[PDB]
């Protein structure tokens, strides 16, 4: 199975660099190119770059002088490294492959890293349960979640029983606070008649912070 | 339109 | 660079109906153009081609057609997992670009939302702050009321809403609404209530609960 997975989202200072990285499986570097787009709030989807199988490198135009891409065949893995980074540099970066090795028709995508540019500090969330009862049960049916509260910068992971439970499961977009910190809301429905036997616990997972919490959430 | 880095979807 | 205006910028469609996105280029490109989806929470996913060309793995219901500058990508019976944006790119010329995207929604019968009320936890109140939440759940269409009431006082400014994307397989958006206080204004009142307004309602619902 052809695969690339880069290394996790975070937080660059203004004029600092940005550095992911690739590795890639179910191919070789020296056969492939890999390339790089990001897609940012104003500029959409943009291509930045590309090594290819022998090494060589195209940049796109505006970033020819800040922009380095590198790789290590051996251990399958592209390293991109972008210096002097801006407020609009906040993107999400992606490397690419092709369907062959010269060609630009990318079928296969990194899952992406959200980078942040920003002065600000890495903050790990506060998780609250947002309990079941009376107040959350119609006909049969229990709405519970957990508070994922004061965080920064996005994004936040969270799963329902360690990924056993999806069906229901609503997650909602992060939302800024005047504090300059994210909250968000994870909730699911689940039958009434579970609540005695079943548990149910939101994992999440603050990969800029290193945070990782299981929160077990429990009727009141 | 805008691109919403949280959901990676167009919001108008 | 060749610049890609793909229009229009959202399409709302019933499901089984056929739908069809426009990408136009500056300048001749010959067939040079892809097509991608993204979908909530995605990576683009390759869909077509070279205008036109299969990709493997890709529904059936998925083409594209055109050379020169105009060029189109169709969908012949939109399913709701369809619900995406759809970027078009061209490599005719260097440096390959993209278009802005065209959003997809799908329409569908309307559905009122389940509401749920949500005191804040014991937990979060040694902090010294309260969040209160309000979920709306799995309703039709987007526009939808939250009205908040602390002891029959209208509150303002002090919550924030949340909406999901629209949801792949029954079409339906979540809506969250968060009251936020602190630990010693929570304190001093006792009756809170989210009120909400929505098309398939045929009153305002509300929810609501006493503080301990
Ligand atoms: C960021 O600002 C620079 C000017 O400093 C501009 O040339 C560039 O296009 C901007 N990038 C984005 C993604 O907005």
């Known amino acids: 199975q052809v695969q690339l997975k880069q290394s996790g989202p975070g937080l660059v200072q203004p004029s600092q660099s940005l550095s992911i990285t690739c590795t890639v499986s179910?191919?070789?570097?020296?056969?492939?190119?890999v390339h790089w787009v990001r897609q940012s709030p104003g500029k959409g989807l943009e291509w930045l770059g590309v090594?290819?199988?022998?090494?060589?490198?195209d940049y796109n135009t505006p970033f020819t002088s800040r922009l380095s891409i590198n790789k290590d065949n051996s251990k399958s893995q592209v390293f991109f490294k972008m210096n002097s980074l801006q407020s609009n540099d906040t993107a999400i970066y992606y490397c690419?492959?092709?369907?062959?090795?010269?060609?630009?028709?990318?079928?296969?995508w990194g899952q992406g890293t959200l980078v942040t540019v920003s002065a600000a500090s890495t903050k790990g969330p506060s998780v609250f349960p947002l309990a079941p009862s009376s107040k959350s049960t119609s006909g049969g049916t229990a709405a519970l979640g957990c508070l994922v509260k004061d965080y920064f910068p996005e994004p936040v992971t969270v799963s329902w029983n360690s990924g056993a439970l999806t069906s229901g499961v609503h997650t909602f977009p992060a939302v800024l606070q005047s504090s300059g910190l994210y909250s968000l809301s994870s909730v699911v429905t689940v039958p009434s008649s579970s609540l005695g036997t079943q548990t149910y616990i939101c994992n999440v997972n603050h990969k800029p912070s290193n945070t990782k919490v299981d929160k077990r959430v429990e009727p009141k | 339109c805008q691109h919403d880095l949280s959901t990676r979807r167009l919001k108008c | 660079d060749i610049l890609l205006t793909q229009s229009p910028v959202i399409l709302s469609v019933s499901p089984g109906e056929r739908v069809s996105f426009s990408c136009r280029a500056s300048?001749?490109?010959?067939?040079?153009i892809h097509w991608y989806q993204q979908r909530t929470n995605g990576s683009p996913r390759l869909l077509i081609k070279?205008?036109?060309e299969s990709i493997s793995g890709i529904p059936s219901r998925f083409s594209g057609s055109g050379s020169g500058t105009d060029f189109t990508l169709s969908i012949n019976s939109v399913e709701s997992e369809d619900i995406a944006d759809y970027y078009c790119?061209?490599?005719?010329?260097?440096?390959?670009?993209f278009g802005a995207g065209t959003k997809l929604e799908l329409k569908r019968t309307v559905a009122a939302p389940s509401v749920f009320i949500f005191p804040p936890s014991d937990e979060q109140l040694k902090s010294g702050t309260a969040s209160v939440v309000c979920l709306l759940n799995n309703f039709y269409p987007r526009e939808a009321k939250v009205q908040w009431k602390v002891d029959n006082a209208l509150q303002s400014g002090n919550s924030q809403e949340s909406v999901t994307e629209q949801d792949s397989k029954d079409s339906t958006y979540s809506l969250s609404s968060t009251l936020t206080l602190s630990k010693a204004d929570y304190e001093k009142h006792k009756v809170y209530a989210c009120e909400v307004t929505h098309q398939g309602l045929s009153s305002p619902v509300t929810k609501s609960f006493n503080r301990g």
């Open positions: 070279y205008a036109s």
């Open positions: 090594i290819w199988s022998g090494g060589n490198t």
């Open positions: 179910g191919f070789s570097l020296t056969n492939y190119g």
């Open positions: 790119q061209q490599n005719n010329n260097w440096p390959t670009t």
């Open positions: 300048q001749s490109i010959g067939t040079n």
């Open positions: 690419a492959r092709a369907l062959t090795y010269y060609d630009y028709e990318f079928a296969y």
